[PDB]
């Protein structure tokens, strides 16, 4: 299977941006449907940003999720720009990649953020 | 000659019901002994023909689906059958001709954070055709009112993501679906496995 | 993807007359020293077939498929690799590739975007553009096999290999018949007479409509290579007297 990877992780404080991108490793077809999460220490299963050609993204924060997607090197980046103390959650990325199978959905282990 | 149902029935891991893996096998030998005698398969029913004498039957065409559910809607498998995973992720026509096996997994499909690696799909304008997967995700909108962007009222994703934890018990079972088609086609009879 | 290879200067071919060619097992029933009759598809004697000599001068031309055709080839190299079969070739018609490479042999069943002019070949061979074709989208059979007795690289000289193959779909299932007729030393003009009775190779499963077809030969240009001939005809259906032998072959047939 291919192993998906969080890098950018790390303390941030409010008001600054942040890059988190997952890179893939292994048998990979090309990238297919992602899709970003997050999940407080305290709140349930939420659908952040992701796709939906058309991209959808969370509430009041369609200007400050920006990603720029990359086929050569079959990983895209996401950036948060301008990020919030209410946002501490950690980002899962959820991958439907084409491999010898004839899909694999992975999730991300994630990177936790603390943003106070 | 063996058909190679081995990595089917001995996946690693079982894709997402809308995800629904299938796959088409032709061209072989599939004798029917060893999955029947595989002793942990719980469940096993078939639709079209005896189950015990598949292999003296030859056909053209084998279709596998491969998928988990819970324990408590694994009779939602039935053709026809009501619920949210038949209407919007994965539909059975009353004239399929097949066998179905179900099986436990609960002691590799249970996370204490909870299993929330499985997903389906529960919005759906147009009900699916039989053997149709729909992959568009779109912001869904319910009443006259436009939506567009945010989520919020008449806005919702139209996938919501399984529970399952160690904790849990009966009706909450991870349970491993398999699903096996063997519509009769003009092509030649191909597969099927050795007559004693 | 192919350059258009052009370099193409055709002449009017060439016809000989089939003096004991076209003769196959009928089936495999196993019989013994008896005269019996048939009734099938079949090539009729001292009619004309196509020849076709190459030695730059290049010739391969679309060829057109009718119920079976009776092919042979005359050489040391082997120079020809793979036939390709279908009806329209455009990405819309199921597509028959077969080749038998170096180390075996591929059959594909898919749907393709061939070259204007395909090839995989300069005395030295390279296997450039080997993959002819510009799509597999739809594939569905695939196939591995022993190659046919093909000897490998060759130096020009004489040409001792004779191979003759008999392709035809009926039933959907398509069958093909051959023998490999070495050390035939004699200078070649016209054909040789020679009693051969193709024997089975393989009955794929599989089955479209056919009604043309191509084979494959052995710097997208500047190519050099030594002569070869090579022949192609029609079959029809007539009828036949077999005589077989005490161990079981046939030793004469007569129309
Ligand atoms: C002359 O022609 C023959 C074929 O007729 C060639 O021999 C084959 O060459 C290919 C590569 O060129 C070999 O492929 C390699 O081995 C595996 C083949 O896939 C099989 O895998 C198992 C069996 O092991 C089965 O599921 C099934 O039979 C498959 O067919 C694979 O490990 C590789 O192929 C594929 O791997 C991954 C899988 O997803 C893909 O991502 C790759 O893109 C690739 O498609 C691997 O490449 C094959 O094994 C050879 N077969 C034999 C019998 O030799 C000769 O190479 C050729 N001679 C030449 C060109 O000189
Ligand atoms: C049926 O097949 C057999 C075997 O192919 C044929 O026998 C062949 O001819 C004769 C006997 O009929 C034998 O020839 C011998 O060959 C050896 C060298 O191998 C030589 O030293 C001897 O002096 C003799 O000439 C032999 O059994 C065999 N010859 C071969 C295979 O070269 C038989 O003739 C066939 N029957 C028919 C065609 O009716
Ligand atoms: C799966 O693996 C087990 C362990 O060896 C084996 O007993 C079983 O037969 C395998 N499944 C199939 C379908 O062969
Ligand atoms: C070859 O020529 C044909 C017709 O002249 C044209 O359609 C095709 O695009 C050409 N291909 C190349 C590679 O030049
Ligand atoms: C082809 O056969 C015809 C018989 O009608 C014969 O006249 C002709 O000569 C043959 N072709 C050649 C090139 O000899
Ligand atoms: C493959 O089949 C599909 C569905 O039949 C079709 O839409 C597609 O055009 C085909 N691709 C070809 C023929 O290259
Ligand atoms: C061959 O052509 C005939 C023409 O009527 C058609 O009916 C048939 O379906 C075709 N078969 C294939 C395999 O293309």
């Known amino acids: ?116 | 000659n063996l058909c190679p149902f081995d990595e089917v029935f001995n996946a690693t891991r079982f894709a997402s019901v809308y995800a629904w893996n299938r796959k088409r096998i032709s061209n072989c030998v599939a004798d029917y002994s060893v999955l029947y005698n595989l002793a942990p398969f719980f469940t096993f029913k078939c639709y079209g023909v005896s189950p015990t004498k598949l292999n003296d039957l030859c056909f053209t065409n084998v279709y596998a689906d491969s998928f988990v559910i819970r324990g408590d809607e694994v009779r939602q498998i039935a053709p026809g059958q009501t619920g949210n995973i038949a209407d919007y992720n994965y539909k059975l026509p009353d004239d399929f001709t097949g066998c179905v096996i179900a099986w436990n997994s609960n002691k590799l499909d249970s996370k204490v954070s909870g299993n929330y690696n499985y997903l389906y799909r529960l919005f759906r304008k147009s009900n699916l055709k039989p053997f149709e997967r729909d992959i568009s995700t779109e912001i869904y909108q319910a009443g006259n009112k436009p939506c567009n962007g945010v989520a919020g009222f008449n806005c919702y994703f139209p996938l919501k993501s399984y529970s399952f934890r160690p904790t849990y018990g009966v009706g909450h079972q991870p349970y491993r679906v398999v699903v096996l088609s063997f519509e009769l086609l003009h092509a030649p009879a191909t597969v099927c496995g050795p007559k004693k």
Not at chain 1, 45 to 53: P, S
Not at chain 1, 89 to 115: M, R, S
Request: glycine share 12%; with cysteine; hydrophobic share 35%.
């Open chain 1, 1 to 116: 299977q291919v192993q998906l990877v969080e890098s950018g992780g790390g303390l941030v404080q409010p008001g600054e941006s942040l890059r988190l991108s997952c890179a893939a490793s292994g048998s990979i077809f090309g990238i297919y449907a992602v899709h970003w999460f997050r999940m407080a220490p305290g709140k349930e299963r939420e659908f952040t940003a992701g796709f939906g050609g058309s991209t959808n993204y969370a509430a009041s924060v369609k200007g400050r999720f920006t990603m720029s997607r990359d086929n050569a090197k079959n990983t895209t980046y996401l950036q948060m720009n301008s990020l919030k103390p209410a946002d501490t959650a950690v980002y899962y990325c959820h991958a439907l990649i084409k491999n010898e199978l004839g899909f694999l959905d992975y999730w991300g282990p994630g990177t936790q953020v603390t943003v106070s």
